Amino acid sequence: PQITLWKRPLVTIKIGGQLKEALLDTGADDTVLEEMNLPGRWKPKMIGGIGGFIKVRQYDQILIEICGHKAIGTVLVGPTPVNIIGRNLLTQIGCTLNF
Amino acid sequence: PQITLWKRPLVTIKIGGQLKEALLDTGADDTVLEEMNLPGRWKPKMIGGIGGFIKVRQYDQILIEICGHKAIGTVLVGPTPVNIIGRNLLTQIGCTLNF
Numbered sequence A, B: 001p002q003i004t005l006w007k008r009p010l011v012t013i014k015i016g017g018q019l020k021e022a023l024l025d026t027g028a029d030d031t032v033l034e035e036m037n038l039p040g041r042w043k044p045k046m047i048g049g050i051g052g053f054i055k056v057r058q059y060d061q062i063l064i065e066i067c068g069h070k071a072i073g074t075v076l077v078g079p080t081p082v083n084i085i086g087r088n089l090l091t092q093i094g095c096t097l098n099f
């Protein structure tokens, strides 16, 4: 599909057997999701943006389905205000910018 | 052009007669540039990111050329970690997401 940018590019994702709304974010190197209790081990990490850094939990080899397209990679979990799909997963679903 | 996301979507921009490098950021509602001098009036504003709020200077109806495409809109100037081109200008240059 093609998504215009008049509004925030929000889509439905599936992760850990749950549906959520997330932002397709070409400005995000990594994928940052709202607080959730994913199983398995994780590594502490900090990521920075406008305003400073937040503490997040890095889970690896996590499957996410974005608009029916499957992707598996690293997902960061922490007190983010919005679910953010970053380039590490956007590349896997064949997402490009076009103008 | 068509831009893949295996690396950061960085492009050259021209604003106030000066060339700079900026990130095409579909997750940003607004355009925010690092500290610089811009002519014309400006009003103090505040914007929030992943790690909190920052104070910016809002410049309205600023000419800015993005990878060869002209836009005239709002540009915020402040302590952002990187120059980011947000949806307010991405829409002007006809940028869409596609997968």
Ligand SMILES: CCOP(=O)(COc1ccc(C[C@H](NC(=O)O[C@H]2CO[C@H]3OCC[C@H]32)[C@H](O)CN(C[C@@H](C)CC)S(=O)(=O)c2ccc3c(c2)OCO3)cc1)OCC
Residues within 6 Å of the ligand: A025, A026, A027, A028, A029, A030, A031, A032, A047, A048, A049, A050, A081, A082, A084, A086, B023, B025, B026, B027, B028, B029, B030, B031, B032, B047, B048, B049, B050, B051, B052, B053, B081, B082, B084, B086
């Ligand atoms: C509504 C909820 O509350 P809120 O109002 C806004 O919530 C939001 C918070 C973040 C975002 C996404 C963020 N957009 C953003 O900053 O946009 C600003 C300007 O325009 C406005 O539009 C929305 C906010 C304003 C960027 O797309 C991506 N970022 C990097 C970028 C700064 C380049 C370095 S990043 O997230 O930090 C990040 C992600 C993965 C990583 C990483 C860093 O490092 C490695 O992996 C969108 C909405 O904030 C009050 C507390």
